[PDB]
Design an enzyme around this catalytic site. Structure first.
Site, PDB file in Angstrom:
ATOM      1  CB  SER A  42      -1.742  75.964  67.375  1.00  0.00           C
ATOM      2  OG  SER A  42      -2.558  76.727  66.486  1.00  0.00           O
ATOM      3  CD  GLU A 140      -7.386  77.773  67.692  1.00  0.00           C
ATOM      4  OE1 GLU A 140      -7.590  78.875  67.125  1.00  0.00           O
ATOM      5  OE2 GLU A 140      -6.250  77.346  68.034  1.00  0.00           O
TER       6      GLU A 140
HETATM    7  O1  LIG Z   1       0.854  75.262  64.320  1.00  0.00           O
HETATM    8  C1  LIG Z   1       1.076  76.353  63.778  1.00  0.00           C
HETATM    9  O2  LIG Z   1       2.132  76.987  63.889  1.00  0.00           O
HETATM   10  C2  LIG Z   1      -0.024  76.954  62.925  1.00  0.00           C
HETATM   11  C3  LIG Z   1      -1.377  76.858  63.599  1.00  0.00           C
HETATM   12  C4  LIG Z   1      -2.510  77.094  62.621  1.00  0.00           C
HETATM   13  C5  LIG Z   1      -3.844  77.074  63.352  1.00  0.00           C
HETATM   14  C6  LIG Z   1      -3.889  78.124  64.464  1.00  0.00           C
HETATM   15  N1  LIG Z   1      -4.037  79.464  63.934  1.00  0.00           N
HETATM   16  C7  LIG Z   1      -5.263  79.924  63.704  1.00  0.00           C
HETATM   17  O3  LIG Z   1      -6.266  79.271  63.994  1.00  0.00           O
HETATM   18  C8  LIG Z   1      -5.355  81.297  63.070  1.00  0.00           C
HETATM   19  C9  LIG Z   1      -4.062  81.874  62.612  1.00  0.00           C
HETATM   20  C10 LIG Z   1      -3.539  83.136  62.804  1.00  0.00           C
HETATM   21  C11 LIG Z   1      -2.263  83.299  62.174  1.00  0.00           C
HETATM   22  C12 LIG Z   1      -1.866  82.180  61.532  1.00  0.00           C
HETATM   23  S1  LIG Z   1      -2.995  80.981  61.690  1.00  0.00           S
HETATM   24  B1  LIG Z   1      -2.555  77.994  65.375  1.00  0.00           B
HETATM   25  O4  LIG Z   1      -2.415  79.030  66.252  1.00  0.00           O
HETATM   26  O5  LIG Z   1      -1.414  77.829  64.655  1.00  0.00           O
END
Ligand SMILES: O=C(O)C[C@@H]1CC[C@H](NC(=O)Cc2cccs2)B(O)O1
Length: 265
Positions: A42, A140
């Site tokens: 993210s 995503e």
């Molecule tokens: O900001 C953060 O640390 C959390 C955020 C959540 C949405 C996104 N994750 C996904 O969409 C799936 C995922 C896989 C494993 C965990 S959440 B992102 O990469 O990370």
């Protein structure tokens, strides 16, 4: 040696850790696996917002974006509650950064436009910043599906740190736009157990987190010393030896950040 302590963390958490703090006029660089690829996760949502800011007058923030239940294909804490009303571009930037809102991200990618739902445009933006390593290849949530050894949707601590440096502390954006990116990152809600957890209370931390499969947990931050001296801290991690569903470990990043603060304070 700081490098040896990072290796201590890798050993203890069974993780791969990547660190970059860029050098300044009064500090050396901190580099650990700085030119190894790690998944963005993210974390790309912060430079994504910078792209949208870069490409448009600030009046664009008020544009209303309507979407449907069918656009909620990823973790989207804000967008999923506003399907009836839509959200302005400004609201999406906010959500993308402060709540890692994956639908906000997808909409802001489409906002940049062009082939790949905006993914090509995003990477092009990073290229305009000097980054010839980083690449975004999917939206995503599919961008999370890349297994270790696949370079899609990856960056390096070195690359992402220097991108953040230019965006927040450099001249990549006009200062009005820069202020916005900064303010949003300052009010992030996702980052309390990462870099923030490793820096004394008298230091200011703004950041953008990311979590993915294979135990991926990243945090990119700008910190200000009690003096007002700013540094960029990029910390990236995975635990890929444990497979696709290895547990991501926030405390790894928090310890990494503590070791970093010990060097900088
Ligand atoms: O900001 C953060 O640390 C959390 C955020 C959540 C949405 C996104 N994750 C996904 O969409 C799936 C995922 C896989 C494993 C965990 S959440 B992102 O990469 O990370």
């Amino acid at each position: 040696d700081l490098a040896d302590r990072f290796a201590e963390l890798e050993r203890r958490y069974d993780a791969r850790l990547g660190v970059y703090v860029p050098a300044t006029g009064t500090t050396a660089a901190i580099e650990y696996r700085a030119d190894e690829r790690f998944a963005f996760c993210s974390t790309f949502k912060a430079p994504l917002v910078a792209a949208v800011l870069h490409q448009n007058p600030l009046t664009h923030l008020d544009k209303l974006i309507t979407y449907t239940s069918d656009d909620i294909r990823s973790i989207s804490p804000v967008a999923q509650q506003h399907v009836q009303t839509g959200m302005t571009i400004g609201q999406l930037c906010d959500a993308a950064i402060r709540y890692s809102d994956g639908t906000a991200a997808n909409l802001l990618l489409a906002d940049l436009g062009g082939p790949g739902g905006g993914t090509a445009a995003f990477t092009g933006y990073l290229r305009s910043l000097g980054d010839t390593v980083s690449r975004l290849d999917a939206e995503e949530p599919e961008l999370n599906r890349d297994p270790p050894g696949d370079e899609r949707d990856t960056t390096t601590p070195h690359a992402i740190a220097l991108v953040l440096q230019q965006l927040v502390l450099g001249n990549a954006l006009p200062p009005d736009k820069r202020a916005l990116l900064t303010d949003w990152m300052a009010r992030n809600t996702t980052g309390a157990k990462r870099i923030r957890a490793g820096f004394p209370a008298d230091w200011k931390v703004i950041d953008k987190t990311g979590t993915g499969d294979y135990g991926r947990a990243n945090d990119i931050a700008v910190v200000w010393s009690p003096t007002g001296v700013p540094y960029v801290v990029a910390v990236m991690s995975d635990r890929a030896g444990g497979g696709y569903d290895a547990e991501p470990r926030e405390a790894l990043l928090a310890e990494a950040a503590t070791c970093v603060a010990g060097v900088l304070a």
